[PDB]
Amino acid sequence: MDFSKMSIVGRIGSEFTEHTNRYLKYSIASQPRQTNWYNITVFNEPQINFLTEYVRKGALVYVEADAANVFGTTLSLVQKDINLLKN
Amino acid sequence: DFSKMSIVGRIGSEFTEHTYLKYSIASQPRGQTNWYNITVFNEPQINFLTEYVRKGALVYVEADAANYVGTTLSLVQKDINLLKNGKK
Amino acid sequence: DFSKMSIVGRIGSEFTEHTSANNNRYLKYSIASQPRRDGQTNWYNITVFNEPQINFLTEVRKGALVYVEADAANYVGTTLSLVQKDINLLKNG
Amino acid sequence: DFSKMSIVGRIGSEFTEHTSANNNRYLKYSIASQPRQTNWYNITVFNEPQINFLTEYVRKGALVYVEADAANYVFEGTTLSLVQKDINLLKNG
Numbered sequence: 001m002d003f004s005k006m007s008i009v010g011r012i013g014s015e016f017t018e019h020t021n022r023y024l025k026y027s028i029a030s031q032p033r034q035t036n037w038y039n040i041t042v043f044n045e046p047q048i049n050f051l052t053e054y055v056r057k058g059a060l061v062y063v064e065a066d067a068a069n070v071f072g073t074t075l076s077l078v079q080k081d082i083n084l085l086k087n
Numbered sequence: 088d089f090s091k092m093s094i095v096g097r098i099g100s101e102f103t104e105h106t107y108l109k110y111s112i113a114s115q116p117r118g119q120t121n122w123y124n125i126t127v128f129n130e131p132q133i134n135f136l137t138e139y140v141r142k143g144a145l146v147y148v149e150a151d152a153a154n155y156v157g158t159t160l161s162l163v164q165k166d167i168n169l170l171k172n173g174k175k
Numbered sequence: 176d177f178s179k180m181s182i183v184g185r186i187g188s189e190f191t192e193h194t195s196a197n198n199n200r201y202l203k204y205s206i207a208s209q210p211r212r213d214g215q216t217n218w219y220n221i222t223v224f225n226e227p228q229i230n231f232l233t234e235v236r237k238g239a240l241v242y243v244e245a246d247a248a249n250y251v252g253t254t255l256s257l258v259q260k261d262i263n264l265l266k267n268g
Numbered sequence: 269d270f271s272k273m274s275i276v277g278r279i280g281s282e283f284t285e286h287t288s289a290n291n292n293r294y295l296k297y298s299i300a301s302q303p304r305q306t307n308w309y310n311i312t313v314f315n316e317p318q319i320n321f322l323t324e325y326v327r328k329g330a331l332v333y334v335e336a337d338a339a340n341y342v343f344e345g346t347t348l349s350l351v352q353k354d355i356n357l358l359k360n361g
Contacts, residue, residue: 001263002114004094004121006152009333009356011088030090036154038090060358062276062333067092069121075160083177083276085331085358089356095242095263145265147183147242168183168270170240170265176278178301178309180338182271210269217271217340247273249307255348 004067006077008038009085012059016051024048028063040065042079050082060086090152092162094123098144098173108133112148125150127164141173178247180257182219184208186239186268190232195224202229206243221245223259236268271338273350275309276358277301279330283322288314295319299334311336313352327361 010030017025024042029035040063042048055061062083068076096114099122103109108127113120125148127133140146147170150162187207195201202223209216221243223229235241242263248256280300287293295313300306311334313319326332336350 002094002096002116002121003263004092004096004114004123006090006092008090009088009358010090031088032090034153036090036152037158038154067121068119069123072157073122073159075158085276095265170183176276176301176303178273178275178277178303178307180271180273183269184271185269208269208271210271215339215341217338218346219271219340247307248305249309252345254346 005080006038006063006065006067008061008063008065010036010038010061010063012055012057012061013037015057016055022048024051026051028061038065038075038077040077040079044079047079047082054087055082055084056087059084091165092123092148092150092152094146094148094150095170096121096123096146096148098140098142098146101142102136108136110136112146123150123160123162125162125164129164132164132167135167139172140167140169141175143173144169145171179260180219180245180247182206182208182241182243182245183265184217184219184241184243186235186237186241187218189237190235199224200226200229202232204232206241219255219257221257221259225259228259228262231262235262235264238268240265272353273309273334273336273338275299275301275332275334275336277307277309277332277334279326279328279332279361280308282328293319295322297322299332309348309350311350311352315352318352318355321355325360326355326357329361330357331359332357 010028013029014027064081065077065079096112099113100111112123147168149166150164153161184206188205191203244261245257245259277299281298284296333356335354339349341347
């Protein structure tokens with residue numbers, strides 16, 4: 001079956017804002033050298049907790065997220081996994 | 088620091104050529120379809136695409152991702168696998 | 176810290192079912208992945224605990240082109256363990 | 269068809285240098301990756317720009333993210349070759 005996943009290494013550039021089954025929302029600033037901002041959505045509740053409990057703003061992370069795209073075109077990135085590299 | 092995408096999907100366009108190659112992949116897990124525009128500079132891959140790959144091909148692409156600000160996604164191809172080719 | 180493998184290849188065995196010392200059921204199968212057809216064919220033995228995937232596989236035919244992601248470890252001769260995390264059926268047998 | 273590995277781990281060796289069958293230069297090193305039991309993986313490097321990148325910038329103990337092409341070579345039993353395709357330095361030594 002078709003898929004589309006994204007892997008990002010970057011820094012957490014926002015607070016964890018929470019919405020309504022809850023979800024968590026935050027952005028990663030990723031700068032390979034030009035700085036790319038990506039908004040992550042989180043439903044997996046264990047990860048939601050892991051983020052709120054342990055992870056502070058400015059953390060270097062490695063995130064994997066499932067990606068989707070029309071209305072303009074909008075990118076949804078739903079988190080699958082997170083590695084805290086440095087808090 | 089990086090941001091890369093991997094996609095499996097079907098090639099949903101002709102290969103249009105600029106000054107690099109452009110094409111779109113329709114990735115449809117079931118059901119909604121996610122359209123991704125791929126940009127190709129790597130010339131060997133550009134040739135591989137034009138010389139072998141037909142529209143409707145199931146492909147596995149990896150691409151470097153960037154976001155240019157409303158916000159737009161650039162996806163520059165780094166690798167391609169042909170999984171199954173198209174009509175003839 | 177991690178070590179994961181992604182494979183595209185064909186299922187080159189029956190699905191044999193076993194018990195794991197820790198007392199889990201797991202499924203074993205091998206993927207033949209041959210990127211060249213002038214180069215060798217890499218055989219990789221996959222272990223599956225995730226029961227939904229175990230069922231998904233038993234309910235997949237031999238020779239299927241698959242895309243598998245698996246956690247990798249080395250266990251001691253020294254051997255490679257590849258525990259399945261996800262599977263995409265690209266084309267069946 | 270493919271079989272790539274992605275590893276996050278620490279460089280656990282010096283960069284030892286060798287030459288190939290066809291007189292081609294390669295670098296060897298190992299990555300210790302410890303998710304939680306510590307997996308050692310031996311990386312082979314031909315891509316000369318990366319060879320330089322390693323020798324020039326990267327110190328032992330570096331946290332790295334490596335992607336490597338994987339192959340299995342049979343003999344006599346089975347051996348895993350991991351040839352580096354890319355490296356990210358996450359934190360140096």
